[PDB]
Amino acid sequence: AVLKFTTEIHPSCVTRQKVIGAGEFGEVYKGMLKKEVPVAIKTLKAGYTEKQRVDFLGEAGIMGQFSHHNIIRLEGVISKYKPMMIITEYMENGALDKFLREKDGEFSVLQLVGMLRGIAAGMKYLANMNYVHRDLAARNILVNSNLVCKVSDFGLSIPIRWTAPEAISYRKFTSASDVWSFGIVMWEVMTYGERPYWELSNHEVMKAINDGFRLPTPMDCPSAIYQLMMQCWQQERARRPKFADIVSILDKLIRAPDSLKTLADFDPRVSIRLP
Numbered sequence: 001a002v003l004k005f006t007t008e009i010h011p012s013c014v015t016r017q018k019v020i021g022a023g024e025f026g027e028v029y030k031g032m033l034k035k036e037v038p039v040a041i042k043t044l045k046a047g048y049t050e051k052q053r054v055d056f057l058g059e060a061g062i063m064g065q066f067s068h069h070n071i072i073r074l075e076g077v078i079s080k081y082k083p084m085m086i087i088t089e090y091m092e093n094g095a096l097d098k099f100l101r102e103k104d105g106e107f108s109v110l111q112l113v114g115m116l117r118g119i120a121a122g123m124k125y126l127a128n129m130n131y132v133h134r135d136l137a138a139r140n141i142l143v144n145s146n147l148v149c150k151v152s153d154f155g156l157s158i159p160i161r162w163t164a165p166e167a168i169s170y171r172k173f174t175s176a177s178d179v180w181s182f183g184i185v186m187w188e189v190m191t192y193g194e195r196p197y198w199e200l201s202n203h204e205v206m207k208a209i210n211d212g213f214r215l216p217t218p219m220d221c222p223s224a225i226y227q228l229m230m231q232c233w234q235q236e237r238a239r240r241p242k243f244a245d246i247v248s249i250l251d252k253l254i255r256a257p258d259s260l261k262t263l264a265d266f267d268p269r270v271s272i273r274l275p
């Protein structure tokens with residue numbers, strides 16, 4: 001019953017080619033699905049525990065439930081044969097963090113903001129479906145050949161720098177802690193994948209947040225975008241925007257693109273004196 005919105009795939013339709021990650025109890029592969037379509041394949045290999053099986057099929061079950069442009073698509077599952085597999089689409093451009101770092105300065109502000117709107121729309125969908133992501137970060141977002149961002153969860157995780165204070169302090173993970181994370185993702189996108197808080201240690205990051213410091217504006221960043229990410233980082237959880245608010249604002253900014261021409265002041269760490 002866990003697999004109501006999933007398609008069962010026969011093993012003869014799947015070819016694994018190269019290991020591209022690790023799972024809870026199995027290896028993630030790049031592969032092909034049957035013209036042939038590229039896929040990512042997470043396996044659950046012999047010896048898995050009862051809890052691992054419940055978690056693995058549960059993951060497939062929730063993923064099949066999601067049908068949205070900005071959420072990774074489940075192609076299907078192999079549950080009747082061993083090893084069991086979860087099969088998703090494969091996005092040629094890979095994960096957003098590495099993508100932006102390899103394409104520094106190559107996109108327009110409107111393109112970057114459009115990526116954030118797509119991420120926000122996927123997260124609005126997840127929150128409305130009563131799913132808390134808990135690990136929203138550019139490393140967990142895939143990019144397709146139309147620049148469409150798809151929220152995913154590669155399970156490689158607490159990511160302190162992305163996590164709201166209440167989730168760190170007392171393990172309260174909600175859609176509002178995912179909003180804090182989204183604000184960090186906005187900063188990642190607008191900086192082309194800079195490391196949040198740079199070289200500060202995890203303890204230093206938490207101390208800075210608790211003392212009220214926040215990440216400074218990225219270079220070339222629209223004022224409205226920095227204002228929005230700053231409101232995602234409010235200490236009081238109830239004061240943060242909901243994802244519906246975020247989607248609404250980003251859609252309005254995109255539809256009136258002159259709104260993005262007003263840039264927030266950048267604080268220069270270096271000064272160069274020239275005549």
Ligand SMILES: Cc1ccc(C(=O)Nc2cccc(C(F)(F)F)c2)cc1Nc1nc(-c2cccnc2)nc2ncccc12
Pocket residue numbers: 020021022028040041042059063066071072086087088089090091092093094095126131133142151152153154155
């Ligand atoms: C096979 C597979 C299984 C599950 C997931 C996944 O995103 N699961 C998941 C679980 C809970 C919630 C969500 C949510 F909500 F969509 F974000 C997704 C992703 C994948 N696909 C993957 N694709 C890719 C990948 C890499 C490069 C290009 N295209 C896909 N890498 C992966 N690395 C590690 C683990 C899984 C990877």
